[PDB]
Amino acid sequence: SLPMLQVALDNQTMDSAYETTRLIAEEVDIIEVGTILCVGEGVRAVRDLKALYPHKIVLADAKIADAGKILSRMCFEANADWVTVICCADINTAKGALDVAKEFNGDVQIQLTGYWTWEQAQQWRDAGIGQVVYARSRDAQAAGVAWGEADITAIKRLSDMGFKVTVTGGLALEDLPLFKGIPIHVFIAGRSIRDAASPVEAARQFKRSIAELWG
Amino acid sequence: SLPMLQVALDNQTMDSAYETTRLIAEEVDIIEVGTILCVGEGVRAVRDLKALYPHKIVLADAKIADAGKILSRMCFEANADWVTVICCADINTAKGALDVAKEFNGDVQIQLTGYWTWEQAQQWRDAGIGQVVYARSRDAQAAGVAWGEADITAIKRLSDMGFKVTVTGGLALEDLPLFKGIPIHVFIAGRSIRDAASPVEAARQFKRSIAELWG
Numbered sequence: 001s002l003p004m005l006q007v008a009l010d011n012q013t014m015d016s017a018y019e020t021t022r023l024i025a026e027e028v029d030i031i032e033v034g035t036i037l038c039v040g041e042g043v044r045a046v047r048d049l050k051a052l053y054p055h056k057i058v059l060a061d062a063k064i065a066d067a068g069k070i071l072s073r074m075c076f077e078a079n080a081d082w083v084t085v086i087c088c089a090d091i092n093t094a095k096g097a098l099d100v101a102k103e104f105n106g107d108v109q110i111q112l113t114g115y116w117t118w119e120q121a122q123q124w125r126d127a128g129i130g131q132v133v134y135a136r137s138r139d140a141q142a143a144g145v146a147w148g149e150a151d152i153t154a155i156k157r158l159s160d161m162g163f164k165v166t167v168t169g170g171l172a173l174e175d176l177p178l179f180k181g182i183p184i185h186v187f188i189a190g191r192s193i194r195d196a197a198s199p200v201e202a203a204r205q206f207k208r209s210i211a212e213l214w215g
Numbered sequence: 216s217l218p219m220l221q222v223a224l225d226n227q228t229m230d231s232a233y234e235t236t237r238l239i240a241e242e243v244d245i246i247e248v249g250t251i252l253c254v255g256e257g258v259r260a261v262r263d264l265k266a267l268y269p270h271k272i273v274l275a276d277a278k279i280a281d282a283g284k285i286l287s288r289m290c291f292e293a294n295a296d297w298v299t300v301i302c303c304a305d306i307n308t309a310k311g312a313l314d315v316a317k318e319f320n321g322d323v324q325i326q327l328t329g330y331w332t333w334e335q336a337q338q339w340r341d342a343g344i345g346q347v348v349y350a351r352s353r354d355a356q357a358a359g360v361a362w363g364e365a366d367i368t369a370i371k372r373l374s375d376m377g378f379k380v381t382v383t384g385g386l387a388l389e390d391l392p393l394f395k396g397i398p399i400h401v402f403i404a405g406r407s408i409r410d411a412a413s414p415v416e417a418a419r420q421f422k423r424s425i426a427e428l429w430g
């Protein structure tokens with residue numbers, strides 16, 4: 001209370017990303033360098049966006065799977081505030097990313113996309129990780145996987161373990177009431193903001209509905 | 216058939232990578248754009264390296280965790296031959312990456328590490344995936360994880376299921392005999408070639424040892 005709003009910049013080039021930021025940067029709390037942008041442009045995307053929007057939290061959605069220390073340091077030397085580690089990373093990778101995060105006063109989020117287990121979730125807590133991103137995969141969504149009660153149950157379980165939980169994955173405005181009454185940290189929207197006829201109205205509607213559902 | 220040798224370019228900038236490729240491009244079979252290089256420079260690394268060495272197999276070690284079709288296509292449009300998909304990816308991510316690979320006459324490898332299961336391995340096979348990378352995480356290695364028996368058994372079992380198995384993760388020359396007798400497709404060396412006093416002789420020593428052990 002209130003859940004923040006994060007825009008995902010899943011763009012292949014910086015100029016494509018800026019078509020969105022130039023409209024909605026001030027309409028959101030967190031600016032994400034999407035994995036698609038990380039791979040498209042590399043870590044310069046993190047450096048550039050933080051330089052443009054230093055007052056915003058910048059998330060480097062690098063989905064680190066190994067070399068936690070090296071990749072985390074690259075992101076944080078580019079001035080990221082937060083970085084993601086994919087759920088299957090070895091626990092030493094997550095720990096390493098977090099050690100480096102702490103040098104920069106940043107933070108690590110575990111990206112829960114695809115396969116993971118409740119035992120891994122406990123390991124993350126024991127290592128001092130305090131953020132997870134409960135993510136429906138884009139590809140799972142495209143094969144017809146809807147949000148369901150099992151998601152709500154799992155989100156609540158993660159919250160109860162002590163994680164600040166981010167909810168994402170093809171979120172539409174209408175999805176937001178599903179999560180009512182859960183202390184969600186952040187809602188991410190990429191396509192439903194970037195690709196809206198009016199990105200400004202789409203971001204303000206997200207913010208409106210959040211304020212209504214968590215006032 | 217002799218295991219091939221792949222060099223991993225886990226460099227933060229193209230120029231650092233090229234300090235290695237100018238010495239060993241012709242001394243190895245596969246040139247890998249390491250995840251660290253993909254994140255440092257973005258997908259231009261793939262395009263640039265393939266342009267230098269168009270006769271060599273170039274692997275984009277992107278460790279795709281979601282958006283299989285998009286990230287796959289970015290890599291393949293940059294002229295990659297092979298791309299990696301991290302083992303926890305939703306099965307549709309893996310399938311989407313493969314579908315794109317096939318349009319480019321390329322291929323996908325599932326990068327194993329973290330946690331994964333044998334039923335998941337069977338899903339990969341059923342989906343048409345024909346390569347896996349049995350990797351010891353750099354961070355696990357740093358925490359003292361050694362190559363052992365459980366690894367030989369798992370590698371053998373993966374091979375019997377029909378995968379071509381690449382073995383990687385801080386490999387030193389001295390590790391190769393651990394895997395003798397198994398039809399390994401590829402051994403990857405990053406640090407043990409790049410950081411050798413003489414990268415050329417390091418690569419040659421690996422090829423000599425391979426030739427002895429699999430001859």
Ligand SMILES: O=P(O)(O)OC[C@H](O)[C@@H](O)C(O)NO
Nearest residue numbers: 008168169170189190191281
């Ligand atoms: O709302 P979307 O277009 O799905 O984008 C947000 C999502 O979190 C992606 O950035 C992502 O990381 N998917 O894995």
Ligand SMILES: O=P(O)(O)OC[C@H](O)[C@@H](O)C(O)NO
Nearest residue numbers: 066223383384385404405406
């Ligand atoms: O021999 P290394 O320095 O461990 O590098 C090879 C390894 O496969 C890495 O490139 C990697 O992908 N690690 O996850």
Ligand SMILES: [Mg+2]
Nearest residue numbers: 008034035061
């Ligand atoms: Mg993202």
Ligand SMILES: [Mg+2]
Nearest residue numbers: 223249250276
């Ligand atoms: Mg690699």
